[PDB]
Every structure is written in C-alpha cells, then in structure tokens.
C-alpha cells in the first residue's frame, strides 16, 4: 500500500487509468483532425489550428489525471492509444459533429466515473472531477455545438463559400 | 403632500409609474431576446449580446424614473413585469422587427407623457423627457430600422449565410 | 432533443426557469427597497445605494441562470415577474428584516434545486449551485443578520440618530 | 429698439429684470445664514460654509440673468437688494427650512416666467429656463428637503448632539 493512500478505493484507481487512456484518445483524433485540415485539398488553417489546440487541451487533460493518480497514490498504467475511427473528416461539419460526440463520450465517462466515486464515497475524487473536468465538458459542448448550427446555416456541407467564411469569421484566427 | 413637491400633477405622477413599468416591460423583452440568441439553436453571439444590452439600457430607463418620481415629491408605486409576448424570437429578422415595434410603442408612450405634461403645464417633465428619452427612441428607431433594411438586403429570412454575416458585420463584436 | 443536452433531466431545466423567476423578483423587491429610501420623507442614501446594488446583484444572479439553461439546452421560459410584497418599507430596520428574509427565501430555493440535483444525478448541477450560489447565500445572509444585530443595539426603529449613524457607518459610502 | 433685438417681449425682458432680483435677493438671505452659523455662539462651520456656498450660486445665476439680457437685446435695470426677513436663523433646521420656501419661492418665479415666454412664444428663454435654471432647483429643492427630514430624524431642535453630527456627516467637510 502507498504510504499516502487513504479513501481511494481500487475500482476508483482503475477507472482512472482508464480515463487518461479516453483523454489521450480523445487528443489523437483531434490531432487527425488537424492533419485533415493542414491538407492542401482542405486548406482550412483556422479550423486545423482550433482542432490542433483541442489536442493540446486534451493531453493536458491526461496529463492532470496522471499527477492526480500519483497524489492519491495510486498507479499509473497505460495501454495503447487506439488510432482514430477515420483517416479522413469529409470536411468541417463532419468534423464538428465528430468532435461534438467525442466531447459527450469523454464527457459520459466523466460522470460515470463521478458516479463511482460517489459509491465509494470519495469526495476529493468527486470535487476533482467537478472542479477540473466537468465544467469544461459542458462549455465546450456548448461551444462545439453552437459552431455547427452556424455551420448548417452556412449550407454545409455544399455551400463552399459557406464553409470559407466560418472558417474566417467563426474560428480564432491563427 | 411631500414637502418638495412643486408643480407636479397627480395626474403626471400616475403617468410617471406606469411609464416606469413600461420600461421594466421593454428591458424583460430584450432580455429574451438575448436568451433566445444564446440558444445552441440559434447562436448569433454579438445579436444576443446587442439585446443583452438593449435590456440594460431599458433598466437604466427605469431606474431614472424611479429617480425622477422622487426628485418631484412623487411616490414609485410598482406593477407585475408582465412578460415577454413570445417565448421564442424566430430569427434576427423577426427579433430585429419586434425591437422596432417595441421602441415605437416606448416612444408613443413618452409622446403622450409629453402631451400630459404640457397640458398641467409642467415645463420640468417636459424639458427631463426632451433631454433624456425622446431622442433616445428617435436614435435607436433609426439604428432598428437600418438593421432591418440590412437583414432583407441580406435576404433574411431565407438567407441563412446573410444572417451569419450581419451577426458578424452590422452589430458590435462582443 | 437539443444537441448539447447531456443528463440534464427535464425537472431540473424547469426547476433552474423557476429560480431564474426568483432572482427577478427578488431583484425587482430590492429596487423597491431602493427607492424607498431615496424618498425624501426616508433620505438615507447609503442605505438605498445598498439597495439598489443588492438590486444589482441579483439580475446577475438571474442571468446566470439564463446562461446555465442554454448551456445545458434546456430553454428559458419566462413568466411574470411579480411586485414585491410591500409598497413602503417602514424604516432600515423593517427592510434589512423583509432582506433577510428574502435572502432566506432564496436560499432555500437553491436547497432545494440542489436536492433535485442530487436526486437526478446532475452533478454538474450541483457543482454550479454550490460554486456560484450557495456560498453566496451564506455571506450575505450573515452580512444582514449583522446589520440587523446593529440596527437593534443602535435603538432602531425608535432612535433617529441610531438609524442616522447606521446611514453613515455600517453600508458603504456612496 | 436694439440691432441685436428680435422675439424678445417688453414684459419679458422686465420680468427677467425683477427674476436678477430676485436671484441676488435668495444670495444675499444665504449669506445671512452663513453669517449666523459663524458666530461664536453658533459655530457650526459645515453648515455656515454649506449657505456661503448656497449664496455664490445665487449670484452666479444672476449675473446669468444679467448676460441673458443682454445677449437678447434687453436692458438691465437693477433695484435695492432688500435685506433678508430674519437677522438671526434659529438653528440648522429653522434655517434650512428657510432656505427650502427660498428655493421654492425662486422656482414660482421661474415657472411663472417660463408661462410668460410660453405666452409670448419664446422658444430660446424658454429653453434657456429649462437648461439652465428649472433643473437645478428641483435638485437643491430635494438635496434641502433631504437635509430637513434628517434634521428631524437626529431630533432638532432640541438634540444638541443631532446637531452637531449633521453638521460633520451630512453637509460637505470644509
Ligand atoms: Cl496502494
Ligand atoms: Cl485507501
Ligand atoms: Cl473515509
Ligand atoms: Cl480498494
Ligand atoms: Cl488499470
Ligand atoms: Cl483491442
Ligand atoms: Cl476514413
Ligand atoms: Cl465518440
Ligand atoms: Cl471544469
Ligand atoms: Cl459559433
Ligand atoms: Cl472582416
Ligand atoms: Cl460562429
Ligand atoms: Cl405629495
Ligand atoms: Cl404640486
Ligand atoms: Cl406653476
Ligand atoms: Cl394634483
Ligand atoms: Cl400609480
Ligand atoms: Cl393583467
Ligand atoms: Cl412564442
Ligand atoms: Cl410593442
Ligand atoms: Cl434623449
Ligand atoms: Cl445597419
Ligand atoms: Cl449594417
Ligand atoms: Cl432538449
Ligand atoms: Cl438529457
Ligand atoms: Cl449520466
Ligand atoms: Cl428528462
Ligand atoms: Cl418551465
Ligand atoms: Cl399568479
Ligand atoms: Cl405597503
Ligand atoms: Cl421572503
Ligand atoms: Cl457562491
Ligand atoms: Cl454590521
Ligand atoms: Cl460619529
Ligand atoms: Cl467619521
Ligand atoms: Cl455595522
Ligand atoms: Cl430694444
Ligand atoms: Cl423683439
Ligand atoms: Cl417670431
Ligand atoms: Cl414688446
Ligand atoms: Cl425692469
Ligand atoms: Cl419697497
Ligand atoms: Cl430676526
Ligand atoms: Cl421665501
Ligand atoms: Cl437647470
Ligand atoms: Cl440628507
Ligand atoms: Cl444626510
Ligand atoms: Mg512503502
Ligand atoms: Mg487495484
Ligand atoms: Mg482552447
Ligand atoms: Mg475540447
Ligand atoms: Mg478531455
Ligand atoms: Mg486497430
Ligand atoms: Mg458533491
Ligand atoms: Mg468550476
Ligand atoms: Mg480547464
Ligand atoms: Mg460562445
Ligand atoms: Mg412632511
Ligand atoms: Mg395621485
Ligand atoms: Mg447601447
Ligand atoms: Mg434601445
Ligand atoms: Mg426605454
Ligand atoms: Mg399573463
Ligand atoms: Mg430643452
Ligand atoms: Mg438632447
Ligand atoms: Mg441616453
Ligand atoms: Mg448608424
Ligand atoms: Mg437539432
Ligand atoms: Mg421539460
Ligand atoms: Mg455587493
Ligand atoms: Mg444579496
Ligand atoms: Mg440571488
Ligand atoms: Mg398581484
Ligand atoms: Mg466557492
Ligand atoms: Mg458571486
Ligand atoms: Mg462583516
Ligand atoms: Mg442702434
Ligand atoms: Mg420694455
Ligand atoms: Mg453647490
Ligand atoms: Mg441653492
Ligand atoms: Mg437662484
Ligand atoms: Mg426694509
Ligand atoms: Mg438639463
Ligand atoms: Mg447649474
Ligand atoms: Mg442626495
């Protein structure tokens, strides 16, 4: 046993281990995303840089639930980082929808794993994950949600010019 | 009778409080409008944050009446805030034409205030309603209704890229 | 079904427009308050400012409310926002007992909402309330109280220069 | 007839004449005030220093009365300055209570002069009553009566120590 364990049961641990492993996930197909975009027959730089900085932010992500094991006293243990579900995004609706439903997928962990924490009766696990994760969860949703009716009432997918201006006007300049 | 009072009709003092409420009704409107904008559904940002502050603006309307009233030896009597008469706006067209008939009906009823006024031959609340409201509503009417000439040249309601455009083209980036 | 909404039950959305209906009328009572005490029959501007800024404070707290439902996806509906209690607030005394008492009400209104939180599992519910809300409550609920205890031992509502004194020493110099 | 003279009524610019009068008349019944509280048996500075001040303001809107005149093509006649109706003003209360029916004696005038030059369709002395004199008497009318519904509250004329903490907290420290 750690000498600093104390109420952090071992289902919690594990759970954990399985969240860094979704964050690192999530981070890697943000990333393919980002590649998409940077592509000569894509060439939508605002948008590649918005999906790059969404990588950034999710290996921050992991990168908190690392040290957070760590401080309990638990143990890191990582497992491969499964490559993206596709090699190419359509364009920016696809991958605005995609992104929105990764964002609900880490998102459903988060309160499932709040859930167990809650079963075990861990408060600083509780206060942790609202405090650091959940909140960033329903902005970003709230976000990524509001860029894709902007993008359908742009005339995506058809609407080329559409598309264009969004990436102007919608995304942060980079 | 308050021992400040001079000039100052019954009459004018009534006409002082439900003006007042009509203000409070007007900052109540906007503030669904700007809800409405705010909407995943919707999301026209500088839209919603133009009547976010169209309803501060009507607060601040309110609250020099209620100023007024006692500066004159009257007494601020309160009615219900009535509210809004849509739960949704449709669109900034819509949004945009209901503002318009909303500051005319404002200014209608500080016409009349001007007409009472000068019938008790109160050169005071005449003179407080020419400095401080009238142009006011002559100002905001012609900024409405040059915006609703922009959002049909836009062709509003149909044109979903022109009512992207005028959220971030005619109206304030916030 | 809004594209955002995740565990969001359809009680709490209403129960969050319910507390959004609460912070307006509590507002709208703390502007009567206000302009009570700017009365020149009253004349204690310090005690007003406090009113009108406690006034201030809960618009804010009520478009946060507003913010938090389109967050979510829910959506705001408005009703009628009701005339406070009373018309004329007797003296400092009699109002800081209707602001406690108000401030309680509120209070427990959020319990309440809190509870439901629970209930249905929304975390991130009860992370907003006890975050941006609870605490809130807490300290101003005390502030009062404090208040109230000063008022008392000052002679109030009997002792004008208590009440004096109160104007000049205990609320902010506006 | 003046080179520079046109819509301005022989009874206007005569009732102009006897409103300069009456401007250096309120002066010189507040320097009177000022005078009282000066002395050694009196000594409330604040409040001496609040009428000295009261009095520069009266002057300050007769030599505005005297430019007017002339600016119009009016000629100022100029009578006795009567001397004020007390030689000695009681207390803080008796003469702020002075000082109120002195500002609402001077705002009579004012209003009846705005009848006449209504009468007379003179659109430029009645804008300027409205700009430059109407307002600022509704607001010393408050300002006094504020003073007034104090001094009671704090118990004059009998409670010496009332007195004295109007003089340090409701009247500008000089
Ligand atoms: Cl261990
Ligand atoms: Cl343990
Ligand atoms: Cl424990
Ligand atoms: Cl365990
Ligand atoms: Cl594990
Ligand atoms: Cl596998
Ligand atoms: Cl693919
Ligand atoms: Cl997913
Ligand atoms: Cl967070
Ligand atoms: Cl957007
Ligand atoms: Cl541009
Ligand atoms: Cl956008
Ligand atoms: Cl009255
Ligand atoms: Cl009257
Ligand atoms: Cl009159
Ligand atoms: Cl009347
Ligand atoms: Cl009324
Ligand atoms: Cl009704
Ligand atoms: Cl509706
Ligand atoms: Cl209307
Ligand atoms: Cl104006
Ligand atoms: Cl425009
Ligand atoms: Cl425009
Ligand atoms: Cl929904
Ligand atoms: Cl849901
Ligand atoms: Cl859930
Ligand atoms: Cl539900
Ligand atoms: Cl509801
Ligand atoms: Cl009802
Ligand atoms: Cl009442
Ligand atoms: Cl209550
Ligand atoms: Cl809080
Ligand atoms: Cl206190
Ligand atoms: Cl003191
Ligand atoms: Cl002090
Ligand atoms: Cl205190
Ligand atoms: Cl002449
Ligand atoms: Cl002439
Ligand atoms: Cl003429
Ligand atoms: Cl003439
Ligand atoms: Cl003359
Ligand atoms: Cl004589
Ligand atoms: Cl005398
Ligand atoms: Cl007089
Ligand atoms: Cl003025
Ligand atoms: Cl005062
Ligand atoms: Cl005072
Ligand atoms: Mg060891
Ligand atoms: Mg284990
Ligand atoms: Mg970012
Ligand atoms: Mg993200
Ligand atoms: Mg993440
Ligand atoms: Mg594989
Ligand atoms: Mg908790
Ligand atoms: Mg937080
Ligand atoms: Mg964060
Ligand atoms: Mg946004
Ligand atoms: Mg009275
Ligand atoms: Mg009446
Ligand atoms: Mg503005
Ligand atoms: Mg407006
Ligand atoms: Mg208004
Ligand atoms: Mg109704
Ligand atoms: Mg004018
Ligand atoms: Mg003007
Ligand atoms: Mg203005
Ligand atoms: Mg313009
Ligand atoms: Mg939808
Ligand atoms: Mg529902
Ligand atoms: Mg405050
Ligand atoms: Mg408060
Ligand atoms: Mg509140
Ligand atoms: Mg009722
Ligand atoms: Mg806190
Ligand atoms: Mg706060
Ligand atoms: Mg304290
Ligand atoms: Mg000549
Ligand atoms: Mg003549
Ligand atoms: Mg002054
Ligand atoms: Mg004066
Ligand atoms: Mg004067
Ligand atoms: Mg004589
Ligand atoms: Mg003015
Ligand atoms: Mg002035
Ligand atoms: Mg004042």
């Keep these: 046993v750690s ?27 943000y990333s393919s995303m980002y590649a998409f975009f940077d592509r000569d027959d894509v060439a939508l730089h605002n948008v590649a840089e918005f999906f790059k900085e969404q990588s950034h932010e999710e290996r921050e992500h992991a990168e908190k639930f690392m040290k957070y094991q760590n401080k309990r006293g638990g143990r890191v ?17 696809e991958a605005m929808q995609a992104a929105l439903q990764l964002e609900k997928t880490v998102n459903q962990a988060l309160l499932d794993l709040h859930k167990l924490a809650t079963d075990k009766v861990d408060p600083h696990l509780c206060d942790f994950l609202e405090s ?17 009716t902007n993008l359908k009432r742009l005339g995506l997918p ?11 006007h919608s995304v942060k300049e980079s």
């Design 132 to 148: 650091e994760y959940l909140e960033e969860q329903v902005k970003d949703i709230k976000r990524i949600g509001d860029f894709i």
């Design 77 to 93: 243990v990582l497992q491969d980082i499964k490559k993206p579900e596709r090699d190419e995004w359509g364009n920016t609706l």
């Design 158 to 168: 058809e609407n080329g010019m559409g598309e264009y201006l969004f990436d102007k």
């Design 3 to 29: 000498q600093v364990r104390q109420n952090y049961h071992s289902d919690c641990e594990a759970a954990v281990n399985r969240m860094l492993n979704l964050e690192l996930y999530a981070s890697y197909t």
